[PDB]
Structure to design on (440 residues):
């Protein structure tokens, strides 16, 4: 079956820069029957290009496609802010029609250090056997950040999950939550809960902490 | 204006059935090949089935052969997908999609680019039972503060959060849910605020979990000692 391999996985580009997205096929795509779609979060895909190089109606001239055989490219000549999206290639030269796995285009901006906040478990949550501790990183760039949990100064492993927002449409920043989950039993056993944050915008790591049961 | 509106999605146990419909308007539906295309959460797109304008030629993805049936009612400008013997792997947002090619006929399933898409209808196949969230405050304490609401242990997706019945929107972050090892979902919604406002202003998160008809308003206020 025709497997389409897109690269890179993620492109980070300032507005006005050239985006070059690649689609490679595992066999020749007949008649250059290759299409590109744009998909924004929460929205359906939008057709940009068909026949490898033909712009769909209404699509801005900055979008163009090229290629044939097994190698195809989508080019955004000068990136606009609203071009933040996942882009998928799709072949329709051979059935079953197949899609690539997508290239995400994100917007590069200047480095912004996160502000950091820590939340203890509520007494309401504690009344039923579970404790969640939450660390928040607000309004930062780039995406890459290290968020480490320490309980009485002991670095934790495997007991936290992270979630990250999409890039803000206004300021191109990210926000992140890290959530440490413990039983209420061992939560009460320890005193100092801390999240340590390492980021390109911070000269040294930043720690926020609370003492259990204190104020 | 062109509309494709899907419905019929929901939560179902493995082995059971669902029927999706897509209702079309604003274009000559009976002149186009129509398709269903699915997208698993966090994943890419996969063509599911297609059917020519006359409804006499159809094709299916390998993974749904013998289980799914595509059909159309040109009089009602509607497309359907009967989905039998559902599996966990069928979990996806299901889009109705119009082919770009106006039909050349000769009775064939062809085309292959989709220029109009619906909003999609969500299908979740799981043996897990619907469960509403517990809502816990993330209280602020000690020039900007933060507070929030923890929306924990619900199934299935999605849950929506607003603050102050829609009046608070700036500074709000409602995070993508994460799947916990228990098989249940959890998320947090936070908002940053000027610290001085903590004494002055009320903060209430409004949580809605439609699958379980769960609506919860949680007042979030500073903790004292």
């Amino acid at each position: 079956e025709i497997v389409l391999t897109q690269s890179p996985g993620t492109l980070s580009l300032s507005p006005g820069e050239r985006a070059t997205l690649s689609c490679r096929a595992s066999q020749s795509v007949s008649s250059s029957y290759l299409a590109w779609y744009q998909q924004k979060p929460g929205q359906a895909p939008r057709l940009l290009i068909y026949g490898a190089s033909t712009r769909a109606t209404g699509i801005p001239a900055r979008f163009s496609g090229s290629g044939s055989g097994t190698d195809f490219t989508l080019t955004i000549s000068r990136l606009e802010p609203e071009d933040l999206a996942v882009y998928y290639c799709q072949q329709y030269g051979s059935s079953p029609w197949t899609f690539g796995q997508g290239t995400k285009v994100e917007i590069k901006r200047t480095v912004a250090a996160p502000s950091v906040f820590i939340f203890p478990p509520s007494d309401e949550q504690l009344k039923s056997g579970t404790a969640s501790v939450v660390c928040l990183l607000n309004n930062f760039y780039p995406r890459e950040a290290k968020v480490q949990w320490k309980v009485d100064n002991a670095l934790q492993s495997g007991n936290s999950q992270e979630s990250v927002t999409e890039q803000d449409s206004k300021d191109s920043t990210y926000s992140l939550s890290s959530t440490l989950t413990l039983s209420k039993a061992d939560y009460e056993k320890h005193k100092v809960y801390a999240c340590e944050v390492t980021h390109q915008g911070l000269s040294s790591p930043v720690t926020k902490s609370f003492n259990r049961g204190e104020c | 204006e062109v509309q494709l509106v899907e419905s019929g999605g929901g939560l179902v146990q493995p082995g059971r059935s669902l029927r999706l419909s897509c209702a079309a308007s604003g274009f000559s539906f009976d002149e186009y090949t129509m398709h269903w295309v699915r997208q698993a959460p966090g994943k890419g797109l996969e063509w599911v089935a297609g059917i020519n304008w006359k409804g006499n030629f159809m094709g299916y993805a390998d993974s749904v052969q013998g289980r799914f049936t595509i059909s159309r009612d040109n009089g009602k400008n509607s497309l359907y997908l009967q989905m039998n013997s559902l599996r966990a792997e069928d979990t996806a947002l299901y889009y109705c999609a119009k082919d770009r090619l106006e039909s050349s006929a000769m009775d064939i399933l062809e085309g292959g680019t989709f220029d109009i898409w619906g909003q999609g209808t969500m299908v979740t196949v799981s043996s897990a039972s619907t469960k509403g969230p517990s809502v816990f405050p993330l209280a602020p304490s000690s020039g900007t503060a933060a507070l929030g609401c923890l929306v924990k242990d619900y199934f299935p997706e999605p849950v929506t959060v607003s603050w102050n019945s829609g009046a608070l929107t700036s500074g709000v972050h409602t995070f993508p849910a994460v799947l916990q090892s228990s098989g249940l979902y959890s998320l947090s919604s936070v908002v940053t605020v000027p610290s001085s406002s903590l004494g002055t202003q009320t903060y209430i998160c409004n949580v809605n979990h439609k699958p379980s008809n769960t609506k919860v308003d949680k007042r979030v206020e500073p903790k004292s000692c």
